[model samples]
Target: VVTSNFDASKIAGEWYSILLASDAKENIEENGSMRVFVEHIRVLDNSSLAFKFQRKVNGECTDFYAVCDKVGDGVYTVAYYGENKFRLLEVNYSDYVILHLVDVNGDKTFQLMEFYGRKPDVEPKLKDKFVEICQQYGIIKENIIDLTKIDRCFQLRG
Candidate 1:
C-alpha cells in the first residue's frame, strides 16, 4: 500500500530538499543548482495542513504557502497556484520523507518527486530509499536530480 502513518507534531519542522524530480517540466534541470526548504507542517483542526516553503524562481527567492486538504490515505490537495495532488509515500518523522505531487489542470499534468531531510543535507545512504520509491512510480534513477549539494540562493531568515 502506498501510505504513511506519521504524527503531525513530530513532522512539523524545517526540512531540506535532498532530491527532486519532475516528469512534465525541464525547470528543475534548467535551474542547475536548485534548492528548496520547507517549514511548519501544521495540521489544522479540520484534518488538513498548513505548509510553507522557500525556493528560487527566475533567479529570485520566493516564498510559497499551501493549505493541504486530505483527500485520501496519505494524499492531499495542495492549493498553491492551483489544486495540486500531494501524496506522502513514506517518512521517518525525525529523518527523511518522500513525496509525490501532481499538478493537473485541463489536459496538462505535471508530476514531481521530492525527497526531504531534517538537515541541510541528508545522508548519502538515504538515496536508496528515494530510488526505491521513484522506481515504484516508473521513474528511473537517471531522472531524479540530486539537490543535497546544490548552491542555495537564499539563506533562512533569522
Candidate 2:
C-alpha cells in the first residue's frame, strides 16, 4: 500500500540522485552498469510526483518497490522494496527539497549524484533523512517509500 502525507507534485522541478542494486552490496560493484538515476519533483497526491530518469532496461521496472514507514514521532523508515537487490540514495530524500538543492540539474551541478550510493549505504541514510524531515515538518508518519528496487539502468551517450 502506498501512503504519504506530502503530495509528490508539490515537489515538482526538484531533483534527487536515486540509487539501485541487485541482491546485495557486492552485486552493485559487480554490476555498476545497472544503476538507476532519477531526478524527481512532487506532482500530485501531496506525495506523488513525476521524475526524469534512466533505469536498467534488462527487466521489469515494477519488479521492485520502495518501503517507507514511520519509526518514531519524528522519524520514518525508508527502504527500497525489491527482490535480489536494494536501492540507496546518497542523501536523505527529504533533504533534496529542504536544502533547496533539488533542482541541482538545472544549475548543471552534479554534486547530488556524487552523494548517492548503493544499498547498504543508502538505506540507512534515507531513513535518517526521513526522520529529519519529519522533525522539520512536525508531522508523524510522513514517509515516502519506494515500492520497487529494480536495477534502474541508464544509457550514456558518448
Candidate 3:
C-alpha cells in the first residue's frame, strides 16, 4: 500500500539510500542494475515525479533521469529495464520513505524494496522497521543489502 498521508513538498528533496532488498539477491549485488543510486527526487506536479540517479557503466558513473507518470496515488510508471512500476509504499516525509519497485523485462518480473533516509545512515529504530517490511514481502535475509556503503556512484563523489 502506498502512503496515504504523503507530503509531496517534503518528498521532493535529497535522499540517501540506506537499505535495498530484492527477491533475487543478484539484483542488488555487485554490478547489479538495481543497485543504481538515487540522487534526487522531485515532484513536477500532482501526477508526475522526476528522479535522478547515478549508475556505473564499466566502472564509470553516468546520470539517468526518470520522468514518471502517475498511475495512482503515490504510484508511478516509468520506462527503464522495461516497464517499471514504482510505488511510494510509505514515508514520513521529513525523514524516510520506502519504495516498492516492480520491473518487467520480457516475460520476467523483478521485485525490489528500497529504503531511503534524509541522512546516509539508517536510524537505529528504522533498521528493524525496514527489515520487518522486507520480511513481510518474503525477502530473505541475505537478499536484504545495506546500501549505504556500497553505492559506488555515491562514493565516487564522497
TM-score each candidate: 0.82, 0.29, 0.89
Return the candidate ranking by TM-score, descending. 3, 1, 2
lDDT of 1 by residue, 1-158 (tens): 22456556666777777788776436467442223557557788888888777777786766767778888867888765446898887778878778888776677766788888787677767787777777787677777887656654336422
lDDT for each candidate structure: 0.70, 0.32, 0.80
Model 3 alpha-carbon drift over 4 Å, by segment: 155-158
Candidate achieving higher TM-score, 1 or 2: 1
After superposition, the stretches of candidate 1 with alpha carbons farther than 4 Å from their true spots are 1-3, 25-27, 30-36
Q: Sorted by lDDT, highest first, which candidate order results?
A: 3, 1, 2
Cα lDDT, model 3, residue 85? 94
lDDT of 2 at 96: 41
- Per-residue lDDT of model 3, residues 93-114, tens digit only: 7788898989899899978999
- Candidate 2 — which residues are off by over 4 angstroms? 1-10, 14-23, 30-34, 56-158
